């Protein structure tokens, strides 16, 4: 769940499993398609916002 | 070089396998240790004759736990009895890990290489063995300088070798670093084997004794009455067997809690017993009298 968006192409995402992360924003997403509250799709090995094609 | 180099097949005699296990099982969960007496012949054939343990002056597997006096004193004793021979390795136990040496135990093995050129470090698992057979593996440590410049493959050829993956990945890194591992074999004398097979001596007397016959009559009544009670269920079971598939039957109608299994087994038990009972008693009257 996108907790707050930091303007530098980084974001603080809240996995519901509890550790928060200063992730990077990669390809196949736009930063005005992310709004606080939006769900994000995270890369498992190094956390990154890889998208949200979700309904 | 001085030799082509290949890792030892360890022919661990009966008395040494059995002894390391006794000491190390008792020592759970501490590290346990001691020295190996043997002889080195051939290009890979180490026969380990006996072991003897090294009294703990440390936590075990330390150089505070290896005492110079102790080492001296034990050797001096073994000469009187002719058990003095050269040290062909040292054993230890991990009972928290598989066969895989930890960093401290590599440091212990690095000191043994100075003592003896062909010294092994043998990891004995006292409880943690993953096969019916005892898992023990022997390792030798040779320098990083030969291994890196690619002399490790040459050393491992012209032998069947042993590959284990008990700690998976962790083992592989360690294995690599140290050296290698090789099949472990067991030396059996046919004197040794025969003593071990016999375990009783009043077996001859016992086979012609019996119990009181009051509790025999009791087992026979209990057996017949109990089989009525699972015979009632047994009729109900074969009302069913109307559901396609073996698995579906077991899940749905609880086909595993089987009345069938418990009757066959209880009938078998009381049955086999009454064959022997008649046999023993009928021998006793006519033989003795």
């Amino acid at each position: 769940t996108l907790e707050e968006i930091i303007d530098d192409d980084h974001a603080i995402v809240t996995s519901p499993t509890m550790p928060d992360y200063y992730v990077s924003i990669l390809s196949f997403v736009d930063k005005e398609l992310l709004e606080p509250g939006c769900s994000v799709l995270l890369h498992h090995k190094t956390m990154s916002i890889v998208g949200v094609l979700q309904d | 070089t001085g030799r082509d180099d290949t890792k030892e097949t360890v022919y661990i005699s009966s008395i040494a396998l059995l002894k390391m296990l006794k000491h190390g099982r008792a020592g759970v969960p501490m590290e346990v240790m001691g020295l190996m007496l043997g002889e080195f012949v051939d290009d890979y054939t180490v026969n380990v004759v006996d072991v003897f343990a090294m009294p703990q002056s440390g936590t075990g597997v330390s150089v505070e736990a290896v005492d110079d006096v102790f080492q001296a004193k034990m050797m001096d004793m073994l000469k009187q009895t002719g058990r003095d021979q050269m040290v062909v390795g040292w054993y230890h136990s991990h009972p928290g890990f598989g066969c895989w040496l930890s960093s401290v135990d590599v440091n212990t093995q690095k000191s043994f290489e100075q003592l003896n050129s062909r010294a092994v470090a043998v990891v004995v698992d006292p409880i943690q063995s993953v096969k019916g057979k005892v898992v023990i593996d022997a390792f030798r440590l040779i320098d990083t300088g030969a291994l890196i410049n690619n002399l490790e493959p040459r050393q491992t050829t012209s032998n069947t070798g042993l590959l284990n993956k008990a700690n998976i990945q962790a083992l592989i890194h360690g294995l690599n670093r140290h050296y290698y591992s090789l099949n472990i074999d067991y030396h059996k004398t046919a004197k040794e084997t025969k003593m071990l097979m016999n375990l009783h001596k009043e077996q001859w007397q016992s086979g012609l004794k019996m119990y009181d016959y009051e509790e025999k009559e009791e087992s026979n009544l209990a057996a017949t009455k109990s089989m009525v009670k699972i015979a009632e269920q047994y009729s109900k079971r074969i009302e069913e067997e109307k559901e396609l598939t073996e698995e579906e039957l077991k899940t749905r109608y609880v086909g595993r809690q089987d009345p069938k299994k418990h009757l066959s087994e209880t009938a078998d038990e009381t049955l086999e017993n009454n064959i022997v009972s008649v046999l023993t008693a009928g021998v006793n009257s006519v033989a003795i009298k």
């Binding site: - | 008792a26 759970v28 969960p29 936590t59 409880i127």
Partner: protein, 48 residues
């Protein structure tokens, strides 16, 4: 530095003489072995 930390638990309830059930103070129940110095009459439910 040649000492270690040891997870405290409590004997939840005896299964056998070799195998005890210890519930640990981190959550999960374990089924544990014994040191053989540990007295078997001193190991029962409540004891830590």
């Amino acid at each position: 530095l040649q000492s270690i930390g040891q997870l405290i638990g409590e004997v939840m309830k005896e299964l056998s003489e070799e195998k005890y059930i210890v519930k640990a103070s981190s959550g999960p129940r374990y089924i544990v072995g014994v040191r053989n110095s540990v007295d078997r009459s001193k190991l029962k439910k409540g004891v830590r």
